[PDB]
Structures are given as C-alpha cells and as structure tokens.
Amino acid sequence: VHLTPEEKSAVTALWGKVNVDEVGGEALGRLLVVYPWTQRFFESFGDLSTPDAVMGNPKVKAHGKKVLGAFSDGLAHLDNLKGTFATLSELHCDKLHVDPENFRLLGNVLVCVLAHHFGKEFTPPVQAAYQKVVAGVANALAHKYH
C-alpha cells in the first residue's frame, strides 16, 4: 500500500483528532449490529440481543479499543502492514476461523463511523485515502489465509 503525501496528510491529521477510546467500540459495535453473523465469534461477550445492548456492552467497547489500536498500529507501518499484522493474521486464520471478507466489512464500518463523527471534514478524498488504509489492513490481516 502506497499513500500519497496528501493522502498521508489527510489520514494522519484526522486520525490525530480520533478519540482512540470510543471509536473502536463504535465500529466493532456496528459490525455486530449491521452484520449479525459476526456475533458468532463474540458469544462470550454476553448481552447482544438488541443494538442498544450491543453498543452498551463493556466487553465490546473494551475489545473495540484493541481493534482501534491495531489500526493505529498499522497506521504507523503503512510501509509494512504485512509484517505488523503477521501475529494477528495467524490468530484470526488458524484459531478464530473468521472469513477475511469480514475484515473488509469491519474496515468499511470504521469508515462509516469516521464519516458519522466527522461529517463535512470526511471529504471524498479523505474517504479515499482511508479506503486505501482499511483495504491494506484487511489484506495484511488476511495474509495467513493466502
């Protein structure tokens, strides 16, 4: 993945503005709500019977934090996503058995979350640069499947 200076600019800037403590929860949450089969992997999180319940779930917000960190991480190594996510690949691939299409779905739910919370700021070129990123993370994360 190669971002342009302006794309790096667009991304790194708006990312700084990100509340790294809730955005991940909100993204994971909407994944569980918008794509309900994903819950299957999270049955240990308890109450997930309505969206309100899912969003207000501490284990989801907790875990969402971790997912967001991983993106923030991969943001550091846009040059090397493949190696960064090598660990996370094996886990998702060999132990969890999560179909990689779901990584793309999470990435797009994240883009929606960013859009929602940043409105006008989330311009179409800004969205574009971010699509490059989440795609890149997904593929890197999907490499122990390849």
């Binding site: 918008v34 969206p51 883009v111 929606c112 940043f118 409105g119 989330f122 179409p124 574009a128």
Partner: protein, 139 residues
C-alpha cells in the same frame, strides 16, 4: 425480507434526506469514483471531477429512483423493474459495483445525518440498499 422496523427506519432516514436528495447521490458517486476508480469506466463520458453537473444530475436521477423504492418498498422489483434491465442488460454493471456504491451512500448519509445514522438505522439502510442492488442486478 425487509422487517417493518427496517421499513420505518429507512422511510425515516430518507424522510430527513430532503431536497438534498440529488446533492447526496452526486456526492455518493464522487466518493465512489475517488475511492474505487475502476467504477469510473461506466462513466467514461461524464465529467467526473468535482463540480461536475454531469455527476450531479445523474446523482439526482439515482436518488429519485431510491426515493421511489422507499415509497414502494414492498414491491421494489416492480418499482425498479425498468432500471433492472438498464443496469444488467444494456449497461452490464458488475454487481460488485452495487456494493461499492451502497457503501459510499451510507458514508454520505452518515456524514450528513449525524443524529439519524444510529446503528439500527445503519443496519436498516444497509439491508435496504442491498435489496435495491439485488433488484438492479436481477436481470
């Protein structure tokens, strides 16, 4: 199917779309063009850059078909029938592109309707757009 709660969500979210209907569909297209450049081949005659009246007018045509689907949400295949043939037969739009456009629509809705884009409405708009896409690639 679309649940009744799906229906009420969509009618609601689209209810507050308002006259911006055209503006939004144009912005969805730009977002798609920038984010997924392969999709530009279907418009190799439109002006695709920012400020394009070509995108904006079609953005309007598209958003009006959506609004038409919102109104006939229970008989969408009959409603969207003529656009089904258009996209699948004559235009031959790759079904992948519907997913790409649908996502950009959500993004555009999320960005203009902070309060209305709740998780539940999000899930409804997704099911809705997926439904429209299904009719449009049906032929």
């Amino acid at each position: 199917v679309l649940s009744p709660a799906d229906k009420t969500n969509v009618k609601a979210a689209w209810g507050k779309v308002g006259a911006h209907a055209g503006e939004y569909g144009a912005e969805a297209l730009e977002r798609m063009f920038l984010s997924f450049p392969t999709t530009k081949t279907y418009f190799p005659h439109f002006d695709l850059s920012h400020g394009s009246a070509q995108v904006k007018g079609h953005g309007k045509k598209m958003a009006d078909a959506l609004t038409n689907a919102v109104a006939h949400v229970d008989d969408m295949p009959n409603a969207l029938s003529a656009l089904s043939d258009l996209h699948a037969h004559k235009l031959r739009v790759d079904p992948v592109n519907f997913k790409l456009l649908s996502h950009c629509l959500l993004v555009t809705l999320a960005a203009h309707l902070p309060a209305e884009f709740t998780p539940a409405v999000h899930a409804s708009l997704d099911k809705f757009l997926a439904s429209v896409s299904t009719v449009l690639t049906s032929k």
